[PDB]
Amino acid sequence: AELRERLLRAARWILLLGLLVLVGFVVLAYLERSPLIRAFVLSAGVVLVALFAAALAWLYLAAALLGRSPLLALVALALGLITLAAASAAMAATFAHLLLEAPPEYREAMLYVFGIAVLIVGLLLLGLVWLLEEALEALLEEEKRREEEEK
Amino acid sequence: AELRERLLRAARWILLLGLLVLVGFVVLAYLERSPLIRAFVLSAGVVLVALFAAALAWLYLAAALLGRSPLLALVALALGLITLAAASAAMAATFAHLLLEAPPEYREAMLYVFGIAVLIVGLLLLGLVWLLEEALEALLEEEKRREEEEK
Amino acid sequence: AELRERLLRAARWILLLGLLVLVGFVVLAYLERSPLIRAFVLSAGVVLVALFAAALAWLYLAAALLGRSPLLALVALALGLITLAAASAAMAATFAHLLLEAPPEYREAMLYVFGIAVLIVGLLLLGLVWLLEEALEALLEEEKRREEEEK
Amino acid sequence: AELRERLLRAARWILLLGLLVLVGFVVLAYLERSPLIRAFVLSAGVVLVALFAAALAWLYLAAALLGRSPLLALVALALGLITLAAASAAMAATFAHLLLEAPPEYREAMLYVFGIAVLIVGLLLLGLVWLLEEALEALLEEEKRREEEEK
Amino acid sequence: AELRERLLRAARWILLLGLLVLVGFVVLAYLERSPLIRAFVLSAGVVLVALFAAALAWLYLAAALLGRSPLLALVALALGLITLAAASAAMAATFAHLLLEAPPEYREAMLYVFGIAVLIVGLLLLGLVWLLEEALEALLEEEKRREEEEK
Amino acid sequence: AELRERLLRAARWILLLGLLVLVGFVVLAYLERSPLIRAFVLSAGVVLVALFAAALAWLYLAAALLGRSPLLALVALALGLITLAAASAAMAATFAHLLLEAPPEYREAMLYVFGIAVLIVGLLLLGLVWLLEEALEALLEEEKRREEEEK
Amino acid sequence: AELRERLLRAARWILLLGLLVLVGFVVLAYLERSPLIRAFVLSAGVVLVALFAAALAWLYLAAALLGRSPLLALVALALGLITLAAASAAMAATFAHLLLEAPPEYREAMLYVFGIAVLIVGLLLLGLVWLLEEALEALLEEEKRREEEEK
């Protein structure tokens, strides 16, 4: 019963975090000396908020399914977390590949952005597993409720 | 009940915004000194309106499902928003990669187009989450109506 | 009731437009000085008619579903429009990438073909949204008919 | 009732056309001066017959579904035509990209093969839309028969 | 009734043909002067037998479905043939691309292997369409049996 | 009955292992002399934990399905293991390709990270097959219970 | 009835074979003079065991479906074999492409690893078709049992 309010709050945390990420990216892109670096940090910030919106949408999808079937919601949440993790790995590999292809003069700035981007990946991964763990935590109660019902 | 009219209006905002985006792109491509830049800004404008049409189609798909099942519509809207966000990230990465590969002489103009394109991504992302938030806002009423019905 | 005849006419417009596009492409490829340019304009014309046939097939698929369920037809039409828009963006990005990779001597001719190709993309996009808008316009009547039926 | 015989004949036209295409490709590859050109024309001929077999298989799939549901057959035929068109565009883009990457000495021969390949694409596209138009032509009779049945 | 025995025999022809293909590839790779050529001919032979096994598996899948529904088996066989043709085109394009990228000294040997590989593609394509034609040939009897049953 | 507790413990092992992997990666990235190497080891550590989270999510998905159908859970677990193995191979090939493309000066450090990454792949593969073997081990009991039930 | 025990034994053969493959790969990577070669042989061994685990999982999936429907199990086994063959071809093409891109000094060692990898592909292909042939062999008994039942 308390899941649905938790899911709404979790989306607020994600949306607020995404606003901070783009604010920081805009600050770095405000006066970056390299136009190529300006696009890179802007794309990294745009990629970060895009996956954050996808994570919020995935959480909302699980919440929508929670009102009909709890077993299906857990499966849907697990599928959404796996899809989010795979997409997060996709952008990390592209960012790492771009950083390796960057020139040594710009690679110093690109690696710092890559480290900041890696922090965003870690924050997204930590939030996803924590939300998934809480989501499956109620499944313990859902299965226990079924066990109590048959008693 | 007020969702369906809201969805129709939201499509009008998207279509009107897409017309402005292509109008601005046509102005920049009207007399651009570099033929390669002409294709780049035209493709960026064509990409922007293409995703805008996809976002409008995704909103209409959720509206169509809203007339049958509200829970399915919310799931469909969340899936459409995630698909739109993933596609938006795809074009942003391609645009950023092209900007990094652009020559320094053209990179100054390419980065300005990239910044304009990034603004379109931000506008699309902001509109998608706002529309999704309003769409799930009625789900609060939909669940409350079910709770009131069982009372 | 008037949708099905409209869909048949819309396919005739698309097929007639595709014939004009390939006729113009054949005229440019008839005596182009560069063999590489000959393949490029021919491929661009072949790509344009291919998506036009796909758009006509997508419209026919919606018309076929219109005879069974109107809600499903609108969803299918929206899905087909999104798929057509995504495919149209795919060829535009490839054409833009090829134009940027073209040599400066040929880039002048390639950019003109790219601009012509961009016009085909705009014509296809404008036709798709107009057809989709008319298709969902009947959904207003379909929902109104259901509302009148329950009265 | 006359569709099924038409589909069988249409496959015979496609198979006979594919035999002519590979016969012409074998003639050009019989004594081509460039071993790279020999592989290119052979692959182009192999690609042409491969899609021709796929088009024949797609037509047979629609014929198989025609014996159970006419509405499903039209949808399946439209889906098969779209898939064939997308695959045809895929090989055209690859052939065009290879032609642009060919050396100027071989590009003269490669462009002639590209033009011949483009003719095969046009023949396949024209046959697919003509077969699809005939397939949906019976849908007019199928819907009219249902209208006559309810009268 | 005679289909199932035919399918078993057809797999035996494919497996026997695959053994001959790898035997010939092993003979060429036994004493090839170029280590790069050794990997290329081995991969081409490995690719040929891999698709041959896939074709045999696709034929067995149609045979398995033949014991339950004949209409579904024909659709499954058509889908398997299309998938096999698409995969066969995929390896042909990769082999052709590798041959074009081969050095002129090795391209003479690579083109001969490409021609041998093209023969394997033709043999696989000819066998697939012949097996599919026989498979749909019984569909004529299956539909005729239904027509005779209703008489 | 003891599966569900085993699945919860297995996730704890995976999450604890992932924390150790990122801790080791952070130690190597804390003072790496090459900024490109810093991104590479960070991406490798981020990739390792991402697949570990996916493996934990896949295990939880099988546990969720275990409460409804045991046969479906085994199929879902097998599908999840195959998907995890395919994704693990994807990152291994990318890491191996990047290591081969690394310069000889950095390749010495890159190969050591590749060997460490290969150990993570082996640990993930060993854990996945061991968890799958235990999961199918209960299927022996599930089938035996059905056999005992019919007795 | 004897299939299920055969499937369990077949997995034991695959797992034991995979252990031998990685043991041999570890021996070659223990003292390889080239760090790039060390990653290549390790990745090839990791790829080999990964597909072996996938093949074992595919066999277990067919065994799980064998307890419910024999016709579905044969279709699932055929689909799994086709997927395994396609994935096996994917790694073979990547390995062959990497071998061709290897420098001549390392290509001698890379080709030997490629030949060893090709042997693993042949062993996997031979085991898959043999297991599939045995799996469909019981389908002969399954269909014969149905024929005997109706007698």
mmCIF file of N, CA and C in Angstrom, chain A residues 4 8 15 35-36 38-40 42-43 46-47 49-51 53-54 57-58 60-61 64 67-68 101 110, chain B residues 71 74-75 78 81-82 85 89 92-93 96-97 99-101 107-108 111 114 118 121 129 136 139-140 143:
data_model
loop_
_atom_site.group_PDB
_atom_site.id
_atom_site.type_symbol
_atom_site.label_atom_id
_atom_site.label_comp_id
_atom_site.label_asym_id
_atom_site.label_seq_id
_atom_site.Cartn_x
_atom_site.Cartn_y
_atom_site.Cartn_z
ATOM 1 N N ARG A 4 3.089 2.794 -3.688
ATOM 2 C CA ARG A 4 2.701 3.763 -4.707
ATOM 3 C C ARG A 4 3.179 5.164 -4.344
ATOM 4 N N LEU A 8 6.129 7.506 -6.311
ATOM 5 C CA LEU A 8 5.966 8.913 -6.661
ATOM 6 C C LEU A 8 7.117 9.750 -6.114
ATOM 7 N N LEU A 15 13.904 13.222 -10.860
ATOM 8 C CA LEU A 15 13.728 14.459 -11.616
ATOM 9 C C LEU A 15 14.547 15.596 -11.018
ATOM 10 N N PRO A 35 34.936 24.120 -28.607
ATOM 11 C CA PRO A 35 33.566 23.858 -29.085
ATOM 12 C C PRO A 35 33.223 22.379 -29.135
ATOM 13 N N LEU A 36 34.196 21.525 -29.457
ATOM 14 C CA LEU A 36 33.958 20.085 -29.420
ATOM 15 C C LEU A 36 33.673 19.615 -27.999
ATOM 16 N N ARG A 38 32.317 21.451 -25.735
ATOM 17 C CA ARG A 38 30.994 21.975 -25.403
ATOM 18 C C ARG A 38 29.898 21.000 -25.814
ATOM 19 N N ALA A 39 30.007 20.438 -27.020
ATOM 20 C CA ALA A 39 29.032 19.449 -27.464
ATOM 21 C C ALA A 39 29.120 18.175 -26.634
ATOM 22 N N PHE A 40 30.337 17.768 -26.265
ATOM 23 C CA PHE A 40 30.515 16.521 -25.529
ATOM 24 C C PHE A 40 29.870 16.592 -24.149
ATOM 25 N N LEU A 42 27.580 18.725 -23.168
ATOM 26 C CA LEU A 42 26.142 18.896 -23.349
ATOM 27 C C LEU A 42 25.467 17.571 -23.684
ATOM 28 N N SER A 43 26.085 16.775 -24.559
ATOM 29 C CA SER A 43 25.526 15.469 -24.893
ATOM 30 C C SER A 43 25.552 14.535 -23.691
ATOM 31 N N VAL A 46 22.794 15.651 -21.542
ATOM 32 C CA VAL A 46 21.530 15.290 -22.177
ATOM 33 C C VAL A 46 21.297 13.788 -22.081
ATOM 34 N N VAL A 47 22.363 12.996 -22.217
ATOM 35 C CA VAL A 47 22.234 11.548 -22.085
ATOM 36 C C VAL A 47 21.856 11.173 -20.658
ATOM 37 N N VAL A 49 20.187 12.922 -18.318
ATOM 38 C CA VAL A 49 18.797 13.231 -17.999
ATOM 39 C C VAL A 49 17.853 12.335 -18.792
ATOM 40 N N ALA A 50 18.253 11.941 -20.006
ATOM 41 C CA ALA A 50 17.407 11.070 -20.814
ATOM 42 C C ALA A 50 17.213 9.713 -20.149
ATOM 43 N N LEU A 51 18.298 9.111 -19.656
ATOM 44 C CA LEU A 51 18.172 7.843 -18.946
ATOM 45 C C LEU A 51 17.471 8.020 -17.606
ATOM 46 N N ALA A 53 15.017 10.139 -17.056
ATOM 47 C CA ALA A 53 13.603 10.134 -17.418
ATOM 48 C C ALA A 53 13.125 8.724 -17.738
ATOM 49 N N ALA A 54 13.957 7.938 -18.426
ATOM 50 C CA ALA A 54 13.603 6.552 -18.711
ATOM 51 C C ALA A 54 13.475 5.740 -17.429
ATOM 52 N N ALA A 57 10.247 6.709 -15.883
ATOM 53 C CA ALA A 57 9.159 6.079 -16.622
ATOM 54 C C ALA A 57 9.074 4.589 -16.315
ATOM 55 N N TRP A 58 10.225 3.921 -16.197
ATOM 56 C CA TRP A 58 10.226 2.506 -15.842
ATOM 57 C C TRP A 58 9.648 2.286 -14.450
ATOM 58 N N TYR A 60 7.455 4.246 -12.975
ATOM 59 C CA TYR A 60 6.020 4.491 -13.086
ATOM 60 C C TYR A 60 5.307 3.313 -13.736
ATOM 61 N N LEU A 61 5.951 2.668 -14.713
ATOM 62 C CA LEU A 61 5.355 1.496 -15.345
ATOM 63 C C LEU A 61 5.166 0.368 -14.338
ATOM 64 N N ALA A 64 2.251 1.329 -12.150
ATOM 65 C CA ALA A 64 0.981 1.102 -12.832
ATOM 66 C C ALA A 64 0.592 -0.371 -12.798
ATOM 67 N N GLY A 67 -0.900 -1.964 -9.346
ATOM 68 C CA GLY A 67 -2.309 -1.900 -9.009
ATOM 69 C C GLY A 67 -3.154 -3.031 -9.549
ATOM 70 N N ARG A 68 -2.593 -3.875 -10.414
ATOM 71 C CA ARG A 68 -3.318 -4.995 -10.999
ATOM 72 C C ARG A 68 -2.773 -6.337 -10.527
ATOM 73 N N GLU A 101 39.298 8.146 -28.119
ATOM 74 C CA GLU A 101 39.540 8.749 -29.422
ATOM 75 C C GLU A 101 39.808 10.246 -29.346
ATOM 76 N N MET A 110 38.213 15.743 -21.370
ATOM 77 C CA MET A 110 37.246 14.693 -21.673
ATOM 78 C C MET A 110 37.205 13.629 -20.584
ATOM 79 N N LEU B 71 -5.039 1.821 -16.924
ATOM 80 C CA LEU B 71 -3.775 1.233 -16.492
ATOM 81 C C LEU B 71 -2.884 0.912 -17.686
ATOM 82 N N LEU B 74 -1.383 4.189 -19.164
ATOM 83 C CA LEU B 74 -0.233 4.686 -18.415
ATOM 84 C C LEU B 74 1.022 3.883 -18.736
ATOM 85 N N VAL B 75 0.889 2.560 -18.842
ATOM 86 C CA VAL B 75 2.029 1.722 -19.209
ATOM 87 C C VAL B 75 2.480 2.035 -20.630
ATOM 88 N N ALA B 78 4.238 5.395 -20.635
ATOM 89 C CA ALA B 78 5.584 5.258 -20.087
ATOM 90 C C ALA B 78 6.520 4.586 -21.083
ATOM 91 N N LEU B 81 7.286 7.144 -23.808
ATOM 92 C CA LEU B 81 8.224 8.156 -23.333
ATOM 93 C C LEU B 81 9.644 7.606 -23.273
ATOM 94 N N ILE B 82 9.798 6.362 -22.817
ATOM 95 C CA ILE B 82 11.121 5.744 -22.766
ATOM 96 C C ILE B 82 11.679 5.566 -24.171
ATOM 97 N N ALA B 85 12.706 8.963 -25.430
ATOM 98 C CA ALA B 85 13.939 9.404 -24.785
ATOM 99 C C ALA B 85 15.150 8.668 -25.345
ATOM 100 N N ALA B 89 18.212 10.401 -27.365
ATOM 101 C CA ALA B 89 19.619 10.227 -27.021
ATOM 102 C C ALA B 89 20.421 9.725 -28.215
ATOM 103 N N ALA B 92 21.231 12.680 -30.402
ATOM 104 C CA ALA B 92 22.160 13.566 -29.708
ATOM 105 C C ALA B 92 23.584 13.029 -29.764
ATOM 106 N N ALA B 93 23.752 11.720 -29.564
ATOM 107 C CA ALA B 93 25.082 11.123 -29.646
ATOM 108 C C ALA B 93 25.642 11.216 -31.060
ATOM 109 N N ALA B 96 26.587 14.850 -31.599
ATOM 110 C CA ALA B 96 27.808 15.158 -30.860
ATOM 111 C C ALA B 96 29.024 14.517 -31.515
ATOM 112 N N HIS B 97 28.883 13.272 -31.981
ATOM 113 C CA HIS B 97 29.988 12.607 -32.663
ATOM 114 C C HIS B 97 30.350 13.326 -33.958
ATOM 115 N N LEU B 99 29.844 16.516 -34.583
ATOM 116 C CA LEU B 99 30.452 17.791 -34.217
ATOM 117 C C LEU B 99 31.921 17.618 -33.850
ATOM 118 N N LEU B 100 32.248 16.551 -33.116
ATOM 119 C CA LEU B 100 33.641 16.290 -32.769
ATOM 120 C C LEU B 100 34.473 15.962 -34.001
ATOM 121 N N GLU B 101 33.871 15.319 -35.000
ATOM 122 C CA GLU B 101 34.568 14.981 -36.232
ATOM 123 C C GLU B 101 34.613 16.132 -37.228
ATOM 124 N N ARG B 107 33.699 23.609 -37.175
ATOM 125 C CA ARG B 107 33.234 23.201 -35.853
ATOM 126 C C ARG B 107 32.593 24.355 -35.095
ATOM 127 N N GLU B 108 33.040 25.587 -35.346
ATOM 128 C CA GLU B 108 32.434 26.745 -34.699
ATOM 129 C C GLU B 108 30.964 26.872 -35.080
ATOM 130 N N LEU B 111 29.078 23.556 -33.736
ATOM 131 C CA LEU B 111 28.774 23.584 -32.310
ATOM 132 C C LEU B 111 27.577 24.474 -31.999
ATOM 133 N N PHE B 114 24.788 22.446 -32.863
ATOM 134 C CA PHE B 114 24.670 21.428 -31.825
ATOM 135 C C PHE B 114 24.007 21.994 -30.575
ATOM 136 N N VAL B 118 20.657 20.805 -29.078
ATOM 137 C CA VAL B 118 20.543 20.416 -27.675
ATOM 138 C C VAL B 118 19.348 21.105 -27.027
ATOM 139 N N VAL B 121 16.391 19.127 -27.958
ATOM 140 C CA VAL B 121 16.331 17.924 -27.131
ATOM 141 C C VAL B 121 15.774 18.257 -25.754
ATOM 142 N N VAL B 129 8.179 14.763 -20.348
ATOM 143 C CA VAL B 129 7.998 14.481 -18.928
ATOM 144 C C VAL B 129 6.794 15.236 -18.378
ATOM 145 N N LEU B 136 0.028 10.624 -15.867
ATOM 146 C CA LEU B 136 -0.022 9.831 -14.643
ATOM 147 C C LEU B 136 -0.767 10.560 -13.533
ATOM 148 N N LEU B 139 -4.013 9.169 -13.415
ATOM 149 C CA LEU B 139 -3.974 7.841 -12.813
ATOM 150 C C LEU B 139 -4.226 7.915 -11.312
ATOM 151 N N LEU B 140 -3.784 8.998 -10.668
ATOM 152 C CA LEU B 140 -4.155 9.226 -9.277
ATOM 153 C C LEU B 140 -5.668 9.327 -9.139
ATOM 154 N N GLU B 143 -7.179 5.760 -9.907
ATOM 155 C CA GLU B 143 -7.101 4.868 -8.755
ATOM 156 C C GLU B 143 -8.014 5.342 -7.633
#
